[PDB]
From Swiss-Prot, chain A:
Entry similarity comment: Belongs to the Mediator complex subunit 18 family.
Annotated protein name in UniProt: Mediator of RNA polymerase II transcription subunit 18
Keywords: Activator, Nucleus, Transcription, Transcription regulation
UniProt source species: Schizosaccharomyces pombe (strain 972 / ATCC 24843) (Fission yeast)
Pfam family, one: Med18
Location in the cell: Nucleus
Cited function: Component of the Mediator complex, a coactivator involved in the regulated transcription of nearly all RNA polymerase II-dependent genes. Mediator functions as a bridge to convey information from gene-specific regulatory proteins to the basal RNA polymerase II transcription machinery. Mediator is recruited to promoters by direct interactions with regulatory proteins and serves as a scaffold for the assembly of a functional preinitiation complex with RNA polymerase II and the general transcription factors.
Subunit structure comment from the entry: Component of the Mediator complex. Interacts with med17, prk1 and rbp1.
Gene Ontology terms: biological process: positive regulation of transcription initiation by RNA polymerase II
Gene3D superfamilies, per database record: Hypothetical Protein Pfu-838710-001
Predominant cellular place of this UniProt entry's protein: nucleus
GO molecular function: transcription coactivator activity; transcription coregulator activity
InterPro entries: Mediator_Med18
Any one annotated GO CC term: core mediator complex
Swiss-Prot record, chain B:
Organism listed in the record: Schizosaccharomyces pombe (strain 972 / ATCC 24843)
Subunit structure: Component of the Mediator complex. Interacts with med18, prk1 and rbp1.
UniProt record similarity statement: Belongs to the Mediator complex subunit 17 family.
Function: Component of the Mediator complex, a coactivator involved in the regulated transcription of nearly all RNA polymerase II-dependent genes. Mediator functions as a bridge to convey information from gene-specific regulatory proteins to the basal RNA polymerase II transcription machinery. Mediator is recruited to promoters by direct interactions with regulatory proteins and serves as a scaffold for the assembly of a functional preinitiation complex with RNA polymerase II and the general transcription factors.
Top-rank taxon: Eukaryota
Annotated protein name in UniProt: Mediator of RNA polymerase II transcription subunit 17
UniProtKB/Swiss-Prot annotation, chain C:
First-to-last residue of the parent protein present: 69 to 122 of 136
Domain of life where this protein originates: Eukaryota
Subunit and interaction comment: Component of the Mediator complex.
Transmembrane segments: none
Disulfide partners: none
Gene that specifies this protein: med22
Primary role: Component of the Mediator complex, a coactivator involved in the regulated transcription of nearly all RNA polymerase II-dependent genes. Mediator functions as a bridge to convey information from gene-specific regulatory proteins to the basal RNA polymerase II transcription machinery. Mediator is recruited to promoters by direct interactions with regulatory proteins and serves as a scaffold for the assembly of a functional preinitiation complex with RNA polymerase II and the general transcription factors.
Family: Belongs to the Mediator complex subunit 22 family.
Compartments, record wording: Nucleus
Name of the molecule in the record: Mediator of RNA polymerase II transcription subunit 22
From Swiss-Prot, chain D:
Oligomeric form and interacting partners: Component of the Mediator complex, which is composed of at least 21 subunits that form three structurally distinct submodules. The Mediator head module, the middle module, and the tail module. The head and the middle modules interact directly with RNA polymerase II, whereas the elongated tail module interacts with gene-specific regulatory proteins. Med11 is part of the head module. Forms a heterodimer with med22. The med11/22 heterodimer binds to and stabilizes the central head subunit med17.
Gene that specifies this protein: med11
GO biological process, one term: positive regulation of transcription initiation by RNA polymerase II
Protein's name according to its UniProt entry: Mediator of RNA polymerase II transcription subunit 11
Key words, A-Z: Cytoplasm, Nucleus
Record GO terms (molecular function): transcription coactivator activity
Length: 207, 104, 54, 98
């Protein structure tokens, strides 16, 4: 699933004012709440895929879940991601990263990645806002570090609580082989960039 | 349609029961009527009655708008196109069910 | 010309987005139940309802 | 000042300029007619103030507009559908529509 996307910081001081320029003119607001575990497959031998994407990323959406409820860890919905990296020579252009959007259904959940033996690594939580445009959507970011490993209880740990709002327009291509959704969605979201340009400056970043 | 059924049996005064269970009966807020007008399947059982000791040929009926007349007796359940099919089926009763009851 | 630029600056101060949806008339909340009577009864019109039954 | 208030400040600043022309015609009148140096000696200490102080008030209205940082581009609205007051008020009508 070839996601196409950009990046642009929004200071919190101007944030909700931007939201007024957003949500009134868009779908949402939708608060995000999803507990990550970016497990790292420490493996042998080199050359390992070793890339950040190559490390596994179980993705437990929990936005409707209680901040203290205990059934979460393997009952609330989970996911998983390796994802391809965004395209080389994708200068200023929206990054194109193919994505394996995994889903799952059992009381066992996390276990299989350790059934694959994969080690624990860094963790966080998408917690920003998202505003629809059909299949395309913008996803402004908040990624607080959780207060404890496998603990859903706030306060969490942004690198600064003067947290940047990493605004992030995107779309998700089914397959990259055709030129259609390429130029089409790039155009639509470039126009979305024209919309944000009335209040922000997004950019590509290498991935 | 249900009126056509009811008028059909007003023709002969057989006991029967329209049985609504509408979504729009419910509305905990004004936004639940928004979900109360969905095209989803809607049960409306009927209870034709002249037989005494024996239980009614209870009916399943969910006239979904798209994407709806299946009764059941002590024998077998059966989808019907027209309500007229139900009518004539209970005519197969008005003869043969009467005869089979006579043989019991 | 200064009147022109002034009117411009007026527009720039005022071209800012409204902070939210703004108040108008939300007065007198509608009945939940007359709505239900219209729905049901006008749809229940000429029908032999047998209440709810167990 | 907030919202319209800056603009309102300009609105009552509006009449503050035309009479400066009275002060200036009198600046001419000081020697053209009144024949007294003292008059324009005062109004050169007035005309420049009445003009420039307003000009500074304007340039600061603009620079502090540039601090307030109101976006210039008009957003192209999505086809908006229903704001909440519109919706529930329509519901009120629906009660009236009963």
């Amino acid at each position: 699933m070839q996601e196409l996307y950009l990046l642009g910081v929004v200071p919190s001081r101007r944030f909700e004012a931007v939201v007024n320029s957003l949500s009134k003119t868009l779908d949402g607001p939708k608060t995000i709440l999803e507990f990550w575990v970016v497990y790292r497959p420490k493996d042998v031998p080199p050359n390992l895929p070793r890339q950040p994407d190559s490390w596994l990323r179980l993705c437990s959406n929990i936005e409707s879940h209680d901040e203290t409820d205990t059934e979460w860890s393997k009952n609330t919905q989970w996911s998983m991601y390796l994802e391809g990296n965004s395209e080389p020579k994708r200068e200023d252009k929206c990054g194109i990263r193919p994505v394996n959007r995994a889903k799952l259904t059992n009381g066992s959940v996390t276990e299989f990645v350790e059934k694959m033996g994969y080690e624990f690594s860094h963790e966080y939580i998408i917690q920003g806002l998202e505003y629809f445009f059909f299949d395309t959507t913008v996803r402004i970011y908040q990624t607080l570090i959780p207060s404890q490993q496998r603990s859903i209880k706030p306060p969490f740990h942004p690198m600064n609580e003067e947290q940047p709002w990493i605004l992030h327009v995107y779309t998700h291509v089914a397959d990259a082989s055709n030129q259609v959704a390429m130029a089409k969605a790039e155009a639509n979201l470039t126009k979305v960039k024209t919309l944000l340009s009335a209040f922000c400056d997004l950019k590509n970043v290498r991935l | 349609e249900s009126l056509e059924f009811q008028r059909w049996l007003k023709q002969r005064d057989i006991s029967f029961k329209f049985m609504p269970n509408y979504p729009w009966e419910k509305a905990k807020d004004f936004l639940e009527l928004e979900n109360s007008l969905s095209i989803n399947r809607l049960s409306i059982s009927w209870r034709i009655m002249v037989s005494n000791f024996e239980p009614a040929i209870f009916i399943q009926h969910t006239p979904t708008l798209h994407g709806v007349w299946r009764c059941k007796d002590q024998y077998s359940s059966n989808q019907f196109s027209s309500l007229k099919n139900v009518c004539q089926y209970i005519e197969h009763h008005i003869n043969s069910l009467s005869r089979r009851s006579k043989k019991t | 010309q200064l009147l022109d630029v002034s009117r411009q600056i007026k527009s720039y101060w005022l071209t800012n987005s409204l902070s939210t949806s703004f108040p108008t008339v939300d007065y007198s909340e509608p009945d939940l139940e007359k709505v239900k009577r219209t729905l049901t009864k006008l749809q229940n019109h000429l029908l032999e309802v047998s209440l709810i039954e167990p | 000042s907030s919202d319209t208030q800056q603009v309102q400040n300009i609105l009552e600043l509006e009449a503050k300029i035309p009479d400066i022309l009275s002060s200036a015609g009198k600046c001419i009148e000081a020697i053209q007619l009144n024949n007294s140096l003292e008059d324009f000696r005062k109004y050169s200490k007035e005309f420049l103030e009445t003009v420039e102080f307003i000009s500074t008030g304007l340039r600061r209205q603009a620079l502090e507009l540039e601090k307030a940082e109101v976006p210039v581009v008009s957003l192209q609205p999505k086809k908006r559908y229903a704001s909440t007051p519109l919706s529930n008020l329509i519901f009120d009508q629906s009660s009236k529509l009963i």
